[PDB]
Amino acid sequence: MKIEEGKLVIWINGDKGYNGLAEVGKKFEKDTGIKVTVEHPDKLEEKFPQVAATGDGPDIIFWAHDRFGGYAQSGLLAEITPDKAFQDKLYPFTWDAVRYNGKLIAYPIAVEALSLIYNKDLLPNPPKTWEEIPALDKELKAKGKSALMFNLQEPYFTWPLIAADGGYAFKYENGKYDIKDVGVDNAGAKAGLTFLVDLIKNKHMNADTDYSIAEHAFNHGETAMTINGPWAWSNIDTSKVNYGVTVLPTFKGQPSKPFVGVLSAGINAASPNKELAKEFLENYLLTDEGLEAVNKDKPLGAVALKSYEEELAKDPRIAATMENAQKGEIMPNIPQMSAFWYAVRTAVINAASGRQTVDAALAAAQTNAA
Numbered sequence: 001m002k003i004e005e006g007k008l009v010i011w012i013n014g015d016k017g018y019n020g021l022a023e024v025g026k027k028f029e030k031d032t033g034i035k036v037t038v039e040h041p042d043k044l045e046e047k048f049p050q051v052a053a054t055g056d057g058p059d060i061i062f063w064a065h066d067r068f069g070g071y072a073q074s075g076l077l078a079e080i081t082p083d084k085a086f087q088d089k090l091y092p093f094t095w096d097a098v099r100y101n102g103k104l105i106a107y108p109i110a111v112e113a114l115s116l117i118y119n120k121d122l123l124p125n126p127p128k129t130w131e132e133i134p135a136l137d138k139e140l141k142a143k144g145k146s147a148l149m150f151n152l153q154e155p156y157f158t159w160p161l162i163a164a165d166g167g168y169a170f171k172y173e174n175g176k177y178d179i180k181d182v183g184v185d186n187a188g189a190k191a192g193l194t195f196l197v198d199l200i201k202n203k204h205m206n207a208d209t210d211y212s213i214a215e216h217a218f219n220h221g222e223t224a225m226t227i228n229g230p231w232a233w234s235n236i237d238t239s240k241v242n243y244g245v246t247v248l249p250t251f252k253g254q255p256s257k258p259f260v261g262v263l264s265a266g267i268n269a270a271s272p273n274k275e276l277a278k279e280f281l282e283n284y285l286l287t288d289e290g291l292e293a294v295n296k297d298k299p300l301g302a303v304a305l306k307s308y309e310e311e312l313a314k315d316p317r318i319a320a321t322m323e324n325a326q327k328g329e330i331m332p333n334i335p336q337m338s339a340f341w342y343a344v345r346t347a348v349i350n351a352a353s354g355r356q357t358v359d360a361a362l363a364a365a366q367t368n369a370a
């Protein structure tokens, strides 16, 4: 078989708590005899539609909900069937994220938003504005440090700045997203991307900075700030850097507006193990003990499971996560999101590297997203 009967194969991103998830899998195996194998392929969210379209791939895929409408439209996801009692365990807005064309198509797990993470020893009082960063970098450089480093290769991390002054993905109005109406090339989006490009032009950041570089720099005390999600806190803890997690800086007086993702677990339509996947997700993973196990490996951040979230909310880092989430927007789950992200990734990388002006980059992004 392309997908093996009698076990579960799971995909989750490599920066999440995949070892903790595997532990939940070992508990499952102990109780049921069903082995669970967790993989973390790179770009799994791009690979999934390729392999699932041929009846292959994992039994279960974990990713933010934004990719799931596309998968569902292509018939790659099984309809899930939790009853009302189970539904009541999770916050209503998380279920909204995973409902597509009249069907629930994934189980919500956690609510993710980026925050500003800062080194308290270098910056006891972190900047409230993006505009403060250039001068702060010049001041820190004289002491052998930089102000800020974050992943410039994934547009997820730059979006909060692009959206701050008015950029948006798809217009939502009167109960629908208008997929012909994109906001990646409005004045606000240009302003935010231009600010980023200027940070690079003025040697405050490097265009080639990626996830690993920014994490390395922050966790080694080479830079005073980074922008990242809750999954990153575990490695910072181990580094012994004294850090805080706070509201993202404003731009032109406007809050940064991160795109909020609901990490969700979908079941492959081609899986011969759908009932076992349901048992694993409902009875083992989406439980206090299951999420705690994953969280202990890499923090989930705010979780969809009310009972556990009530405990996590007491953590000031989680409060900061929710504050940033409230200033941002939940991502659409519509199929056009794949095109949107391709468009914006291309624009940010080309603008940052100087291959395109901001105006040309975002003009192309508008065409490509719509």
Ligand SMILES: OC[C@H]1O[C@H](O[C@H]2[C@H](O)[C@@H](O)[C@@H](O)O[C@@H]2CO)[C@H](O)[C@@H](O)[C@@H]1O
Pocket: 013, 015, 045, 063, 064, 065, 066, 067, 112, 154, 155, 156, 157, 261, 263, 341
């Ligand atoms: O950067 C584009 C990318 O953004 C989001 O992916 C996030 C993901 O949601 C987070 O859980 C975390 O792993 O960071 C990822 C970015 O590297 C979108 O969900 C994704 O579809 C999109 O390609």
Ligand SMILES: [Cl-]
Pocket: 151, 153, 154, 210, 211, 212
């Ligand atoms: Cl990266």
Ligand SMILES: [Cl-]
Pocket: 220
């Ligand atoms: Cl080093």
Ligand SMILES: [Cl-]
Pocket: 286, 287, 288, 289
């Ligand atoms: Cl529970």
Ligand SMILES: [Cl-]
Pocket: 179, 334, 335, 336, 337
């Ligand atoms: Cl769409």
Ligand SMILES: [Zn+2]
Pocket: 216, 217, 220, 222
């Ligand atoms: Zn280094």
